[PDB]
T-cell receptor, first 184, second 240 residues
Framework: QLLEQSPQFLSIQEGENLTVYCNSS?????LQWYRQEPGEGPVLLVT?????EVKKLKRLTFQFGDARKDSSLHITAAQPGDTGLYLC??????????FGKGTKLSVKPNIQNPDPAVYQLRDSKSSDKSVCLFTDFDSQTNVKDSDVYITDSNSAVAWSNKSDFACANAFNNSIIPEDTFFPS | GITQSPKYLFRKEGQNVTLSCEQN?????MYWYRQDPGQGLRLIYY???????QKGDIAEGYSVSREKKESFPLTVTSAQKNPTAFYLC???????????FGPGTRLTVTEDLKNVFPPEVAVFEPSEAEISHTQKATLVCLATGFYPDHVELSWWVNGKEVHSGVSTDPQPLKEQPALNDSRYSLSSRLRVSATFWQNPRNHFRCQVQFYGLSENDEWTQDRAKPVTQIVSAEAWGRAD
């Protein structure tokens, strides 16, 4: 009927633990959890069947609530490879299987000696357009129109087909940290 | 255990398309879903046993057959008004909802074959300031202006593909994200040691495989037909 998943998005450092949730308006006979990579098929992680059931599969721990309307998925020591969309699915005696919208998890690889910096690179063929590269920033960094273009691991790139496009503009009001190396 | 083919599908509106799903797990039940960015997975059709099918919530404009245990073909007809989506097939045991999914197929449908454009591809050379700061050198590849968003990017150095140091965007991004009618871009980074970049005998190539028009598609325009094709750009080592 209604399957809700929380949080919708989660960005975390490698090494962090996390818990995500599946909440239902109605009782389920069973509930399944899946992980999906972009443009790939969801992979089944678990089925839970009994109210109160806890299943530990290695770094992943699942619980089905006593009332069979809620489920948690917990990851211990998250790894870059855990990145993906975690899907919840179930049915309950109406027997209409229903899919949640998912939690999109992004795990940022460790960076033990950060060196946040913004660089400007030139085109090989030198039409002399450039891109801006923001790199070597830690996990507590989060990355004015559809023209200025951006791509968010530990690096982000920005580009634009305007001439007043400066790298200082593309990466600021944003979240470059305090000691970012920013060469001319 | 489950095959969908092909990975990418491009069609003009009004043209029926049949998506294949074949299964060797000896499962009775088979399923079709569509996946849209704001929705997760929605059931199109469910077939619990050979010859049995039940419509999902969005079967409007879709058709399926199930004459064999091992195959579940999906036809997308002209009556589906929003057919662009990622389509996933799955199978399960008869008395279960524990599913095993195929790899999925990206279908894109367009008003006009003239709306297809292959990527332009450019490689941006490592910053000398990065090199002196970190002793590392990041190359950036940009593929831009393409439609449909059906591309695969790879990096090749001295003619051999590499994976170490590569970080590619998981999916193409709309250049006009706030709007329906948009072309796509994709970026990728290759990071190597400065010493490796500074060797002029090292040749770095960004290669983008585009999936576009097929040779049974007709084309009358002056510009080169936007067929499935590879587009590449290079930057060579610089001993600065």
């Amino acid at each position: 009927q209604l399957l809700e998943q929380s949080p919708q998005f989660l960005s975390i450092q490698e090494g962090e633990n996390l818990t995500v949730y599946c909440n239902s308006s109605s009782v389920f006979s069973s509930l399944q959890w899946y992980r999906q990579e972009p443009g790939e098929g969801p992979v089944l992680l678990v089925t839970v069947v009994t109210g109160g059931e806890v299943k530990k599969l290695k770094r992943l721990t699942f619980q089905f609530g006593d009332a069979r309307k809620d489920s948690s998925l917990h990851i211990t020591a998250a790894q870059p490879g855990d990145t993906g969309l975690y899907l919840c699915a179930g049915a309950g005696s109406q027997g209409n299987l229903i899919f949640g919208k998912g939690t999109k998890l992004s795990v940022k690889p460790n960076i033990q000696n950060p060196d946040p910096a913004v660089y400007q690179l030139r085109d090989s063929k030198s039409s002399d357009k450039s891109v801006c590269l923001f790199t070597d920033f830690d996990s507590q960094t989060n990355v004015k129109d559809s023209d200025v273009y951006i791509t968010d691991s530990n690096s982000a790139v920005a580009w634009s087909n305007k001439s007043d496009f400066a790298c200082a503009n593309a990466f600021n009001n944003s979240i470059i940290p305090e000691d970012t190396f920013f060469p001319s | 255990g489950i095959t969908q083919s092909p990975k990418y599908l491009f069609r003009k509106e009004g043209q029926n398309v049949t998506l294949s799903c074949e299964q060797n797990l000896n499962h009775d039940a088979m399923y079709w879903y569509r996946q849209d960015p704001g929705q997760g997975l929605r059931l199109i059709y469910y077939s619990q046993i050979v010859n049995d099918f039940q419509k999902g919530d969005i079967a409007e404009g879709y058709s399926v057959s199930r004459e064999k245990k091992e195959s579940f073909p999906l036809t997308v007809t002209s009556a589906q008004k929003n057919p662009t989506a990622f389509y996933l097939c799955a199978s399960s045991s008869r008395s279960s909802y524990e599913q095993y999914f195929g790899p999925g197929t990206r279908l894109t449908v367009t008003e006009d074959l003239k709306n297809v454009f292959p990527p332009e591809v450019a490689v941006f050379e490592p910053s000398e300031a990065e090199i002196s700061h970190t002793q590392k050198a990041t190359l950036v590849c940009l593929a831009t202006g393409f439609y449909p968003d059906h591309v695969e990017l790879s990096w090749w150095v001295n003619g051999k593909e590499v994976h170490s140091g590569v970080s590619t965007d998981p999916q193409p991004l709309k250049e006009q994200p706030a709007l329906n009618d948009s072309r796509y871009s994709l970026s990728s980074r290759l990071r190597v040691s400065a010493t490796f970049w500074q060797n002029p005998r090292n040749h770095f190539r960004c290669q983008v495989q585009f999936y576009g028009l097929s040779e049974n598609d007709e084309w009358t325009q002056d510009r080169a037909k936007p067929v499935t094709q590879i587009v590449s750009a290079e930057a060579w080592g610089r001993a600065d």
